[PDB]
Amino acid sequence: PTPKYTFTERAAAGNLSDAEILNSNNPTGSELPDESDVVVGGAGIHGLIYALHASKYKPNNLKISVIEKNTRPGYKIGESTLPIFYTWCKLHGISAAYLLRLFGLKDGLCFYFLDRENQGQYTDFCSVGAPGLVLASLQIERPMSELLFTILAQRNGVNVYHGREVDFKSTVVQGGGQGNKIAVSRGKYDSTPKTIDSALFVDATGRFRQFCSKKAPRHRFDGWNCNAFWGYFTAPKDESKIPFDLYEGDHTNHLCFPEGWVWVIRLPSWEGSPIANLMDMVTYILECADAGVPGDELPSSEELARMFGLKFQWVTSIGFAVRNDVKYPEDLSAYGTREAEQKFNYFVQKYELLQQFMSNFELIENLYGPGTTWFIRKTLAYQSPVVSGPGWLAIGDACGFTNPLYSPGINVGMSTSTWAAQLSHPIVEIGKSAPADAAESSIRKLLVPYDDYCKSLVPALEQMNRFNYVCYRDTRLGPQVACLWQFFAGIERYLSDVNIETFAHYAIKWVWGAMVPEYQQVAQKCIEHIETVPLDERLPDAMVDELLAFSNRIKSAAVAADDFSLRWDAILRSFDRSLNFVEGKTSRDIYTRQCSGCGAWLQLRPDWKKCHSCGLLGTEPQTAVTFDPPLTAEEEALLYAAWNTAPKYDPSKELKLPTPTRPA
Ligand SMILES: Cc1cc2nc3c(=O)[nH]c(=O)nc-3n(C[C@H](O)[C@H](O)[C@H](O)COP(=O)(O)OP(=O)(O)OC[C@H]3O[C@@H](n4cnc5c(N)ncnc54)[C@H](O)[C@@H]3O)c2cc1C
Ligand SMILES: CC1(C)c2[nH]c3ccc(Cl)cc3c2C[C@@]23CN4CCC[C@]4(C[C@@H]12)C(=O)N3
Ligand SMILES: CC1(C)c2[nH]c3ccc(Cl)cc3c2C[C@@]23CN4CCC[C@]4(C[C@@H]12)C(=O)N3
Ligand SMILES: [Cl-]
Ligand SMILES: [Zn+2]
């Protein structure tokens, strides 16, 4: 495909604002339609996942309009994604060669547990991702992911309107076929709002809960909650002075300690780029995806920036997520003038390993515009008691949220977005095909499982979060109990069998393994014990011994009962194939390398000889995956064979679940 500059030139020719050039790519036009089947409030990641999955699940069945008040895709925290998300992107026609042009490579999750009373001591928990010929995970800049999904939506019959706001004061949502009149304006000041007559409203307004907050007060869980404060930093090419042994930048790294943890995410940023130019670059990437352009013949990220006149840079997202029962000194003026900056810098100097770590990074001022050097958000976790009703349902953060840890926000949250998407087809058809009372009753009964799933989802995630947090109070419980159990219960078994048809059903059965009985049993034992130790104290060594012994007794039987074959010793650096902790073990598979030219992390596969980020040809044209223990040529061919082909679904075979096999 020859690159086209359609939007850059259209924007200049008509002197178009950001919202106008974006809305000009809509299939039905730049102005709002008088009527639609579904109106989606909000074009965050979940509103767009919803609209994309709905249209892809059953094309040309629903007219869908998405309303977003930002003038262009705005900044969001929430950058780490997991295999289920990549698989969804691949099922929607965008595989790793194209996604890696826009987003950062992610190869697994790594944890470092810092001893508070023994400053300098630490342990770790390492895990790898997958070979390049299997899949990739992604670190995504959210203005770019939401641009990507906006353009892809517009190319699949979905209209997306930026710079437009749902007026929840005058909007009417009812049952009865085409019962909704969604009022859309350019803002409070706008005297001439438009109405979209529609059947179904989707609340995808995130934590603002702009519609469902009208139906039930926000619900908070018992006990402590969390606060987060964060900023953006340079990303060094040379990672060798990082004070943690075997550190690698292409993991989602976790620096864990009694009060909480720190995320470290390496990702590319497109900030400074005009929106029209970005639209042209994304459109070009999609055309290359459609045409199946091989990765080595696809321009590198930096080459795309030159082609389309973009700004491109490597940044590190670094933030704290800590309990809100931490005692702070009253006066923190020595660490800055803003509260976020003050508590960030205060926490860094409380741990010598954090300060030595942060000394590798340079602060970036105002990456996302003025006032954005530092961010703070208080009291993270919540749940919406009511997530559906006549004429509407809620998805994503609008249903509830817990914590950044293990990234449930996007990767678990998309189970609601995609299930709601699948359900929207019968919901709309019912309303077109039955009298009003029976339509309302049938739709209500159809959504009972959706409501019940959401109701129990966030509490399970909250228990999962507390489980990890309390275990992070000790450098043995963190890696040997909490991390081990999260990955044993939550690894995505049979992900290679999922397709568009079965995606939502698979996704709602995952929950990061937080529903697995043996997981909840260990989690409850640890929480019950550790929550009785005041935060400012060290856990008694006998308590750690007892919890570790309890966890290991439950583990051996649950592991024996799993019938899923997996080279555990190759994936978890510190564990053998039966998930026993091995004190000296360092052997692991190696799926990635760092580009010597630009520092970008790359996936090892023989058909990708050039760095996908800067284009530098491979340091030597023969670095291949290292399997430890080794795999034969046939076993390696077999692994790849299972993941290149996506299966058309048979309506008869039952879905294989991601969670471990029941002992029964
Ligand atoms: C500190 C922190 C770290 C996190 N880290 C991660 C991570 O690593 N990985 C992960 O997966 N998740 C992470 N999360 C969670 C993640 O940020 C959220 O789960 C996710 O961004 C929510 O997506 P959403 O589409 O539901 O809502 P949002 O992305 O918040 O989008 C809601 C949208 O609604 C729009 N809107 C609001 N009102 C109106 C209106 N009246 N009319 C029109 N539009 C409107 C807004 O403009 C916005 O675009 C993190 C969260 C926090 C707080
Ligand atoms: C299942 C998978 C998506 C996964 N999900 C994880 C969750 C937590 C942790 Cl710690 C690791 C993983 C992995 C690594 C895996 C293990 N599988 C071995 C055969 C194919 C595959 C897929 C992939 C692979 O190559 N790497
Ligand atoms: C298991 C089932 C009740 C189910 N439970 C779901 C929950 C959420 C979502 Cl999104 C979908 C489903 C389905 C669809 C299924 C899948 N099964 C294939 C063989 C028989 C059956 C039963 C049924 C079938 O025909 N359709
Ligand atoms: Cl993660
Ligand atoms: Zn490079």
From Swiss-Prot:
Active site residues of this protein: 106
According to UniProt, the reaction catalysed is:
(+)-premalbrancheamide + 2 FAD + 2 chloride + 4 H(+) = (+)-malbrancheamide + 2 FADH2; (+)-premalbrancheamide + FAD + chloride + 2 H(+) = (+)-malbrancheamide B + FADH2; (+)-premalbrancheamide + FAD + chloride + 2 H(+) = (+)-isomalbrancheamide B + FADH2; (+)-malbrancheamide B + FAD + chloride + 2 H(+) = (+)-malbrancheamide + FADH2
Q: Name one GO molecular function term.
A: monooxygenase activity
The protein's required cofactor(s) are namely: Zn(2+)
Cite the binding residues for FAD: 46, 68, 77, 80, 142, 166, 397, 410
Q: Which UniProt keywords apply?
A: FAD, Flavoprotein, Monooxygenase, Oxidoreductase, Zinc
**Consequence when changing residue 107 to A:** Leads to very low malA catalytic activity
Give the cofactor note text.
Answer: Binds 1 FAD per subunit.
Stated EC number for the protein is 1.14.-.-
Q: In which pathway does it act?
A: Alkaloid biosynthesis
Outcome of mutating residue 251 to F: Displays selectivity for producing the C-8-chlorinated isomalbrancheamide B but does not affect the selectivity for bromination
| Gene3D superfamilies recorded | FAD/NAD(P)-binding domain (3.50.50.60)
Q: Which Pfam families match?
A: Trp_halogenase (PF04820)
**Free-text biotechnology note from the record:** Malbrancheamides have the ability to inhibit calmodulin, calmodulin-dependent phosphodiesterase (PDE1), and induce both endothelium-independent and endothelium-dependent relaxant effects, suggesting their potential as vasorelaxant agents.
What protein name is recorded for this chain?
A: Flavin-dependent halogenase malA
Provenance organism: Malbranchea aurantiaca
Q: What is the lineage of its organism?
A: Eukaryota, Fungi, Dikarya, Ascomycota, Pezizomycotina
